[PDB]
Amino acid sequence: GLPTMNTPGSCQFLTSDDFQSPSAMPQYDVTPEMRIPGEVKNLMEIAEVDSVVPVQNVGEKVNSMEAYQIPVRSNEGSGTQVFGFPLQPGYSSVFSRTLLGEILNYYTHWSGSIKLTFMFCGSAMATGKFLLAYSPLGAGAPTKRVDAMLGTHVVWDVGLQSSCVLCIPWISQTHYRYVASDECTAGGFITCWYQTNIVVPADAQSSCYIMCFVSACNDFSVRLLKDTPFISQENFFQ
Amino acid sequence: GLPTMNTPGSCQFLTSDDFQSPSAMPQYDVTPEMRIPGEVKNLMEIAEVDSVVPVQNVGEKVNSMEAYQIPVRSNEGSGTQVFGFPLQPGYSSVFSRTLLGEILNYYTHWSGSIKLTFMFCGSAMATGKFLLAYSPLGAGAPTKRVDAMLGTHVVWDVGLQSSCVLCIPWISQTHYRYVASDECTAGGFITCWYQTNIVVPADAQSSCYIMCFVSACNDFSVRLLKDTPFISQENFFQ
Amino acid sequence: GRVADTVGTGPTNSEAIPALTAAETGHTSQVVPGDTMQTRHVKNYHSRSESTVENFLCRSACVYFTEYKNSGSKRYAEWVVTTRQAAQLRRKLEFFTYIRFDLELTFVITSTQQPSTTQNQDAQILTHQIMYVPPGGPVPDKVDSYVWQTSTNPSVFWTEGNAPPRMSIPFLSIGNAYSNFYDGWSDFSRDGVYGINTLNSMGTLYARHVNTGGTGPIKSTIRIYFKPKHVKAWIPRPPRLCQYEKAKNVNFQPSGVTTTRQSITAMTNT
Amino acid sequence: GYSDRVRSITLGNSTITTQECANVVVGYGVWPDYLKDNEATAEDQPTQPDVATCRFYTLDSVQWQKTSPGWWWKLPDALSNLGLFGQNMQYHYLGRTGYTIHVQCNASKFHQGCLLVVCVPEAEMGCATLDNTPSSAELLGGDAAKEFAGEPIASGSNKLVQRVVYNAGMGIGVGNLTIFPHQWINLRTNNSATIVMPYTNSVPMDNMFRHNNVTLMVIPFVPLDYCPGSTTYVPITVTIAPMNAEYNGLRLAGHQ
Amino acid sequence: GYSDRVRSITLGNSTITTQECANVVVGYGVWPDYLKDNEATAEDQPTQPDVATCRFYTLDSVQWQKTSPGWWWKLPDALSNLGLFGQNMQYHYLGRTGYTIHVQCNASKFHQGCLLVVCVPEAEM
Amino acid sequence: SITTPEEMIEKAKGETAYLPCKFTLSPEDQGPLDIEWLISPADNQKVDQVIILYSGDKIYDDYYPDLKGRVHFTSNDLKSGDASINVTNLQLSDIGTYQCKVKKAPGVANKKIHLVVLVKPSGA
Amino acid sequence: GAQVSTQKTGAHIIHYTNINYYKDAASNSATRQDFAQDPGKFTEPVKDIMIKSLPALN
Amino acid sequence: GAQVSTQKTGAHIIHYTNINYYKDAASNSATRQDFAQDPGKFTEPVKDIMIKSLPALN
């Protein structure tokens, strides 16, 4: 016998272990592989696909299609606020059930840039201009347009090209931020303001809707696998 | 199965063991390293930095800044003693809480030479000369200047260069000495005497203060890690 | 790794003054014995290997222990992972302002039968589960919870009598180093608790009995041992003088800078 | 001829001279510099103001009395209300800087005394009340110096700093503060101390209001003494210049 | 494909888009630039903040009524309370700048009206 | 944890005391939120008595006959980090030590407030 | 892919063998033989070099 | 017939050894180092390429 000595850890079952083991079915011949469309190699490939944001998640609107609709209308002034929410892509109820959010909730750390695409869905006769703004943390969320304008922003002019992209760049003191809510790694604020009005001719509807989409940029990644808080169980199903 | 035989020591947990072990987090991607100033590779790099000695550690003076101050004054004679303490760099209360001492109290053995730097902090109008002396063991500590003079010593003349270095060389029958108190490895004695007087003009203070610093020479080393007697605990903190 | 030799020197009479300097400058003098006395030449072979930062830090230490029972009220243990509840390892780490390391975790789990009146006790062997929940993961609120299903949380299962269970953890910070000290706040208004960040957040450990054994009551104790590995460290500090008071802050009771002796020429301690 | 006691330091539209100096301490051997591409994480283009902010600011003076325990200043915060350095702190999420610190105190050849001048990274201080942590007003002097105490601060149910000098507010031995970058101002040798401090942190950039990452401390080890008929008012004066300053994350002004 | 009606303009952390534009007028043929050595008179080293101040600021909106006579804005002064451009105005004796001005007004294919947009050097009133 | 866990507050009879209990959550704290306020009166030898509870999305009053209708939460939104309470129409017989207990597993925190009520309205 | 390295021995060389078994670096054994040193950043952090045989201030 | 491969390490290489012991592929250890990606089948599944700087519809 070769003289050996067992180390601590001997005979434990660690659920993330990677060891060989004898097969119960010697020489079994697996069914050959087929070329199937849509092969997935990495979960980030899913995260980079756009999905629809439920921005208007207020009261009973989460039990209908209205949660995905952002109201806009012709006003009797300018510069009022359209929406606002925080950059908490895994923890904000705005973001938590998107494709990006559902993947994030299996991880502890996230890093990288994010894209918000907006699509105007009024009639072709409606025109308008909007200010989309991101304000890094440290001073709170902006309350007027003249304070939102100081941060990073895009002025969207509505026309033949129906959609506009706001890029939220990675601006952080750390290389990563937590998926859970945490003030040391606060993300900042996203808001939208009327730059000019919505203007329509007679016999066109003066109320309209915008839709928002989220996805990850090519610089995005996640760390430290964990269990999601979304699925649960009291007994084994039947 | 390869025929093997377990040796004694199998399945023990020895706290200073060095074995591989499976990671609980497969393929996790650590945050990249940053260039941070002040990297430390070896605790001796700390020991070679000077720190202030509490020579006047008498009574309530340990609860003030006076513990670090060595009194000198203009006398009506010469040759009286200024201070004395033993070369017990880990065990003497004079030395035990310095940088050098705090590192020593994690070790069982010490070897090498030591430097004591003195800085005169009287007024620029004050002059004086001092004898700094080390007396190897075997005959007890000197009680007069004429006995201190027989050993190894420096005569410090106070002037534009404000500081003077006494080197305590390694003179021992053994290659190492114990950090704990032990008569077989006694270190000897350090004393300081007035060589001439402190002399000042009128309208200058006739009392003054010296400060002492300790560090290790480039020949110094330590052996056999242990627990320090300085930190303790009755329950887990909260 | 060796220490420096001693150069032999003879008598001297010159303008060179190696032993006179100015400590005001912040510089530590580089004097050796040959500067101030006649010395022989010495071939020194002593080494400094036992005081590298790695060898100084890489020993197992118990950071925490707790208890849980097979019946009654406290059926599982729960511990937020930290180094700041045990004095000996905290003090060693706080020699440095910033530090990177990996960890080796070892668990020492032992059990004791408790006094009772139950007759005919024939307990079977006990298995234990230890689950690690990263921060943000859901936590169990009872010993029989779906959380113990551990689809994505690493868990170790271990039966009494075998070798102690052990696993490695990589450097886990969102920052480029762990910070042992933080002079600031987490909230931008600085009206909160001072000294709190999340650069050291490591998660939670839960431990339970899988089976109850027999009809009698049994209490177990789990001791957690941390050994740092692959260490890098920066910005040395004065070692902690005052005794530790709290786990989450540096609060102290004032104390003298050392202990006393009788007089400034006294050769012994008091 | 030449003398190694004289020194001039020019930054932006400011210059400082001294005729009785010791040397200049440089950090941990590292001179300050801008953050490089292969260590950056924030993606936006940084602003680098470069003379509007990298220049000497002189703070309010402080009196050295025979019983003074000592003083401290948290560094980003000490300059936070002061010039365009303050304005850039107020308008940006993120900032990065080093410093040139210069401490001045002259007195005659008949005065005596000795001060330690130290720059302490991450000087997290303790509360007098063991369960509490100290309030902001107790820790942040804000362009006015904060004072140490001679005796222990009494425990109550307060939020005061445990201020006693021989533990440096930090539960340590004050004589061991020489492991940090430092000089001594010893009245018979020297009337100035200068330390060049590089940026130090566990992250590449940080918020400047939330976190004070270095603390200047000035502590008399040998008390001020003199004889009657000599001048009794001896001030100490600190001047600080940020070096290689950068800012990221522009938005509306404030800290909340 | 392509269309000469669309335009994007990015400065600092700001960007502006438009889908029905005409062209871009450049001054008197001269694009803005820093002052050169052989035309300088002030000897101190200038500060050049470069993204903190060179970016789009949006002013308060104004209503076009059927009887509106028109509006004017003096340029340094319009931005004088506004961001780090305002702060640098407040802390310095001397300043030098050009501008990109962008005026926006949309309405339907059923509205009609015409505005002159002019930039007047030295408009002493 | 809770911001200032040890403090003392002085008010006069007839005025209404604000007892601040503001807390911050760690990312590990993912259990359900529990908020308890209990009392140890100075005059009386009864000790550790619940006065007001909050659990499972709702409040529970009516635990201390003495403070009946005179103990309420001050925040419209408690789970955002505010568990402060108001006591009203203060009299001498309530001088004591109030205790605020916030639970969200794994995390647990408490805060002790020593309320002194004085005869005359005067901080001396 | 074994690596051979020298053991710690006394003065007045003998070797040992290692093979990594796991897929992550954090599983490896400790790094106990890094004996580099650099004390000059803590001692002597001065802008002007100070030659030991000369006066420090002139 | 040992295979040597690189471990997962940090950025600012170290190797490990494996030998298969069993006769079926299904006995081998997991395949944890396959880092290829191909998101263009899910993003951009359009017949006509869309150049990012141009209008999408003309």
CA C213 to CA C127: how far, in whole Å? Answer: 9
* Torsional class of B45: left (φ above 0), alpha (ψ -120 to 50), beta (otherwise): alpha
Contact assessment for residue C106 and residue C59, using Cβ atoms and an 8 Å cutoff: no
Look at strands B107-111 and D14-18 and give their pairing.
unpaired
Pairwise CB contact (< 8 Å): D4 & G50: no
Contact assessment for residue H14 and residue H7, using Cβ atoms and an 8 Å cutoff: yes
CA B93 to CA C264: how far, in whole Å? Answer: 12
Pairwise CB contact (< 8 Å): C246 & D123: no
- CA D241 to chain CA centroid, Å, is 10
Which neighbouring-strand residues pair with F58?
Answer: F55
Pairwise CB contact (< 8 Å): B3 & A5: no
Of A13, A224, A227, the CB nearest to C156: A13
Task: For residue C91, give how far its alpha carbon lies from the nearest alpha carbon of chain D (Å).
Answer: 12
Burial group, residue B101, by CB count within 10 angstroms (0-12, 13-18, 19+):
buried
Look at strands D25-26 and D192-197 and give their pairing.
parallel
Helix (H, G, I), strand (E, B) or coil at C244: coil
Which single residue is written with the structure tokens 């110096």? D145
CA A57 to CA A70: how far, in whole Å? Answer: 10
Helix (H, G, I), strand (E, B) or coil at F93: helix
Residue type, D74: K
Contact assessment for residue D150 and residue D164, using Cβ atoms and an 8 Å cutoff: yes
- CA B203 to chain CA centroid, Å, is 38
Of A8, A16, A221, the CB nearest to B24: A16
Burial group, residue C224, by CB count within 10 angstroms (0-12, 13-18, 19+):
buried
CB of A174 within 8 Å of a chain F CB? The answer is no
CA D88 to CA E83: how far, in whole Å? Answer: 10
Contact assessment for residue F105 and residue F31, using Cβ atoms and an 8 Å cutoff: yes
Q: Is the dihedral of CA G45, G49, G52, G57 positive or negative?
A: negative
CA G34 to CA G29: how far, in whole Å? Answer: 13
What does the DSSP 8-state code read for residue B127?
B
Contact assessment for residue B94 and residue B121, using Cβ atoms and an 8 Å cutoff: no
Residue B196: both structure tokens together: 């001439």
Report the residue of chain F nearest A229, measured CA to CA: F30
Chains C and D touch (3+ CB pairs under 8 A): yes
Helix (H, G, I), strand (E, B) or coil at F9: strand
CB of D209 within 8 Å of a chain A CB? The answer is yes
CA C229 to CA G26: how far, in whole Å? Answer: 8
Contact assessment for residue C256 and residue D142, using Cβ atoms and an 8 Å cutoff: no
- Structural domain boundaries of chain D? 7-250
- For chain F, which chains pass the contact test of at least 3 CB pairs under 8 Å? A, C, D
Contact assessment for residue E18 and residue A157, using Cβ atoms and an 8 Å cutoff: yes
Kindly list the distances between the CA atom of residue F20 and the CA atoms of A103, F24, F85, F91, in Å, as whole numbers in the listed order.
39, 13, 7, 19
CA F43 to CA F117: how far, in whole Å? Answer: 12
Which single residue is written with the structure tokens 């209708």? F69
Torsion of CA A16, A17, A22, A23, to 10 degrees: 20
Kindly list the distances between the CA atom of residue B156 and the CA atoms of A171, D109, D112, in Å, as whole numbers in the listed order.
60, 21, 20
Kindly list the distances between the CA atom of residue H33 and the CA atoms of A222, B26, C99, D185, G23, in Å, as whole numbers in the listed order.
16, 10, 29, 60, 9
Residues sharing a CB contact under 8 Å with residue A238, sequence separation 6 or more, in sequence order: none
- Per 3-state DSSP, chain D is made up of helix, strand and coil in percentages (nearest 5) of 10, 35, 55
Q: Cβ atoms within 10 A of the Cβ of E67, count?
A: 5
Q: How many residues does chain C have?
A: 270
Residue type, G13: I
CA D155 to CA A220: how far, in whole Å? Answer: 50
- Nearest-CA neighbor of G28 among H6, C15, C130, E78? H6
CA D61 to CA D145: how far, in whole Å? Answer: 9
Look at strands B114-120 and B207-216 and give their pairing.
antiparallel
Helix (H, G, I), strand (E, B) or coil at D242: strand
- Nearest-CA neighbor of C242 among C224, C254, C230, C227? C254
Provide the terminal-to-terminal Cα distance of chain E, rounded to the nearest Å.
Answer: 48
Which single residue is written with the structure tokens 């072990």? B21
- Structural domain boundaries of chain B? 1-238
- Per 3-state DSSP, chain C is made up of helix, strand and coil in percentages (nearest 5) of 10, 30, 60
Can the peptide bond before residue F106 be classed as cis, meaning omega within 30 degrees of 0? yes
Contact assessment for residue B98 and residue B83, using Cβ atoms and an 8 Å cutoff: no
Contact assessment for residue C170 and residue C193, using Cβ atoms and an 8 Å cutoff: no
Which single residue is written with the structure tokens 């001050």? F74
Contact assessment for residue B161 and residue C21, using Cβ atoms and an 8 Å cutoff: yes
- Nearest-CA neighbor of D157 among B10, F95, F8, A133? F8
Which of A149, A152, A208 is the best substitution to test chain E (most E C-beta atoms within 10 A)? Answer: A149
Q: How many residues does chain F have?
A: 124
Which neighbouring-strand residues pair with A134?
Answer: A152, A190
What's the 3-state SS for C37-51?
CCECCECCCCECHHH
Q: How many residues does chain B have?
A: 238
Which of B55, B74, B123 is the best substitution to test chain D (most D C-beta atoms within 10 A)? Answer: B123
Residues sharing a CB contact under 8 Å with residue E38, sequence separation 6 or more, in sequence order: none
Residue type, D72: W
Q: Cβ atoms within 10 A of the Cβ of C111, count?
A: 16
Q: Which residues of A touch H36 (CB under 8 A)?
A: 41-42
* Torsional class of D249: left (φ above 0), alpha (ψ -120 to 50), beta (otherwise): left
Residue E97: both structure tokens together: 């700048």
Contact assessment for residue D182 and residue B116, using Cβ atoms and an 8 Å cutoff: no
Q: How many residues does chain D have?
A: 256
CA B55 to CA B88: how far, in whole Å? Answer: 13
Counted across chains B and C, CB pairs separated by less than 8 A come out at 265
What does the DSSP 8-state code read for residue F23?
B
Provide the terminal-to-terminal Cα distance of chain H, rounded to the nearest Å.
Answer: 61
CB of F8 within 8 Å of a chain D CB? The answer is yes
CA B48 to CA B214: how far, in whole Å? Answer: 9
- Nearest-CA neighbor of C154 among C173, C175, C170, C142? C170
Report the residue of chain A nearest B18, measured CA to CA: A7
CB of D202 within 8 Å of a chain C CB? The answer is yes
Phi/psi for F108 (5° steps) reads -145, 135
Pairwise CB contact (< 8 Å): G31 & C230: yes
Kindly list the distances between the CA atom of residue C220 and the CA atoms of A169, C67, C75, C79, C109, in Å, as whole numbers in the listed order.
51, 5, 10, 15, 7
- Nearest-CA neighbor of D223 among F51, B165, B66? B66
Q: Cβ atoms within 10 A of the Cβ of D203, count?
A: 23
* CA within 13 Å, CB half, D220: 24
> Residues followed by a break in chain D, C–N over 2.5 Å?
none
CB of C169 within 8 Å of a chain G CB? The answer is yes
Kindly list the distances between the CA atom of residue F44 and the CA atoms of F6, F39, F47, in Å, as whole numbers in the listed order.
22, 11, 8
Q: What is the resolution of the experimental data for this entry, in Å?
A: 2.2
- List, as one string, the DSSP characters of D13-72: TEEEEESS----EETTS----PPPGGG----SPPB--TTSSSS-EE---EE--TT---EE
Counted across chains C and F, CB pairs separated by less than 8 A come out at 42
Provide the terminal-to-terminal Cα distance of chain D, rounded to the nearest Å.
Answer: 56
Pairwise CB contact (< 8 Å): A6 & B10: yes
CA D213 to CA D198: how far, in whole Å? Answer: 11
Of D133, D140, D203, the CB nearest to C175: D203
Residue D76: both structure tokens together: 């980003």
What does the DSSP 8-state code read for residue C29?
P
Residue A221: both structure tokens together: 């990644």
Which single residue is written with the structure tokens 């209300």? D81
Find the radius of gyration of the CA atoms of chain G. 21
The answer to whether domain D7-250 has CATH 3.40.50.920 is no
Q: Is the dihedral of CA D201, D207, D209, D210 positive or negative?
A: negative
Pairwise CB contact (< 8 Å): F24 & A182: no
Residue B228: both structure tokens together: 């320090």
CA F37 to CA F83: how far, in whole Å? Answer: 9
225-264 in C: which are within 8 Å (CB) of D? 235-242, 245-246, 249-258
Contact assessment for residue C114 and residue C220, using Cβ atoms and an 8 Å cutoff: no
- Per 3-state DSSP, chain A is made up of helix, strand and coil in percentages (nearest 5) of 10, 30, 60
Q: Which residues of C touch G43 (CB under 8 A)?
A: 27-28, 30
- For chain E, which chains pass the contact test of at least 3 CB pairs under 8 Å? A, D, H
The alpha helices in chain E, defined as continuous H runs, are 75-78, 83-91
Phi/psi for C49 (5° steps) reads -70, -25
What does the DSSP 8-state code read for residue A7?
P
Pairwise CB contact (< 8 Å): D93 & A150: no
Counted across chains A and B, CB pairs separated by less than 8 A come out at 54
CA C13 to CA C21: how far, in whole Å? Answer: 18
203-222 in B: which are within 8 Å (CB) of A? none
Kindly list the distances between the CA atom of residue D99 and the CA atoms of D11, D26, D182, D210, in Å, as whole numbers in the listed order.
11, 10, 14, 19
- For chain H, which chains pass the contact test of at least 3 CB pairs under 8 Å? A, B, E, G
- Structural domain boundaries of chain C? 1-270
List the beta strands (DSSP E) in chain A.
Answer: 2-4, 13-14, 51-52, 70-73, 81-86, 107-111, 114-120, 129-135, 152-157, 163-168, 177-178, 189-194, 207-216, 221-225
CB of B46 within 8 Å of a chain C CB? The answer is yes
